[PDB]
């Protein structure tokens, strides 16, 4: 889904698999905060949500615990209790159109 209608999915009771998160080289914008970037298997907070959108280009950097802008004024906003963080991807011909 797009940014204007951002979709969320709650992860139910299951054993968290975070080992392949850091060993994957496909992640190049894991500039994110919160808990320590090593003890992910030692934390099992009660509920976890994953929210997805397709914002473009350099607008991703405005996602921060407290920020304003054309994206972070009338769209997804980050509070000061945002435990967890953000993973970004890279665009290609998979999401593209010549026309």
């Amino acid at each position, epitope marked *: 889904a797009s940014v204007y209608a951002w979709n969320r999915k709650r992860i139910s009771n299951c054993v968290a698999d975070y080992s392949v998160l850091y060993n994957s080289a496909s992640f190049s914008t894991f500039k994110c905060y919160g808990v320590s970037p090593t003890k992910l298997n030692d934390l099992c907070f009660t509920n976890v949500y994953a929210d997805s959108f397709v914002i473009r280009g350099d607008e991703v950097r405005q996602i921060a615990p407290g920020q*304003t*802008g*054309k994206i972070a*004024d009338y769209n997804y906003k980050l509070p000061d209790d945002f435990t967890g963080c953000v993973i970004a991807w890279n665009s290609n011909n998979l999401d593209s159109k010549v026309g």
Partner: single-chain antibody, 225 residues
Framework: EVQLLQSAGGLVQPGGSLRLSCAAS????????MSWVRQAPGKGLEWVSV???????FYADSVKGRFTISRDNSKNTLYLQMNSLRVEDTAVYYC????????????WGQGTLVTVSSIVLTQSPGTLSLSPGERATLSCRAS???????LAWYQQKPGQAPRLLIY???SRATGIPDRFSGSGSGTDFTLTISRLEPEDFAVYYC?????????FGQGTKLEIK
């Protein structure tokens, strides 16, 4: 009949304080964007600040912190405070509503002048002196190669306020007649004026938006051989 009035024609002592004023004539300032542009006579135009609905303000890269802009909905004003100012600050301080995506700077203010104590976007052609009776081509190049529709065109006037010609290089603004056309993509955008009229000889600028702080061209003048 929208009108944007300004009144700031006053001399400033070294390290003085001044308060500009921009008003509104029918549209509320609490639901539309406002922006300030420095004319910089003898050079192309620049950018100062942008305010969104809400009231978060973004400043230019050159000037940081010292500027203090504020909005007063009770009196419907767009106040801007100049604190202790340094050298090289004498220029015009136009204020205008910003709808860059749908119409770039459709209406402007009237202009002012504040004195002092005691993106790579370029316009290629230049003066290109010609005569009425044919067309002409104006080329604007950008180094970042913005994708589709993030460049607009402006027309100046001696002593008057800048005017909008085309927004997004695809469709002209309201009141713009069919003697102006625009095309081009990738790196360069071309503008053509057909059937030159006496009320067409004016400075033409190309400006970029939808990106990092806005930049205008150096300035292209129309002259008669």
């Amino acid at each position: 009949e929208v009108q944007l009035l300004q009144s700031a024609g006053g001399l400033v002592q070294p390290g003085g304080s001044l308060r500009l004023s921009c008003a509104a004539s029918g549209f509320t300032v609490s639901a539309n964007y406002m922006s300030w542009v420095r004319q910089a006579p003898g050079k192309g135009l620049e950018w100062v600040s942008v305010i969104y609905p809400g009231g978060s303000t973004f400043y230019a890269d050159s000037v940081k912190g010292r500027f203090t802009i504020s909005r007063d909905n009770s009196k419907n004003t767009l106040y801007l405070q100049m604190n202790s100012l340094r050298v090289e600050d004498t220029a015009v301080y136009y204020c205008a509503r910003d709808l860059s995506v749908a119409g770039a700077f459709d209406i402007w203010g009237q202009g002012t002048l504040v004195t002092v104590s005691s993106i790579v976007l370029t316009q290629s052609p230049g003066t290109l002196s010609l005569s009425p009776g044919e067309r002409a081509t104006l080329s604007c190049r950008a180094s970042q190669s913005v994708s589709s529709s993030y460049l607009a065109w402006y027309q100046q006037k001696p002593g008057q306020a800048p005017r909008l010609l085309i927004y997004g290089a695809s469709s002209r603004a309201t009141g713009i007649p069919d003697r102006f056309s625009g095309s081009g993509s990738g790196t360069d955008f071309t503008l053509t004026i057909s059937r030159l009229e006496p009320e067409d000889f004016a400075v033409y600028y190309c400006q970029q938006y939808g990106s990092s702080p806005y930049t205008f061209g150096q300035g292209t003048k129309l002259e008669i051989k």
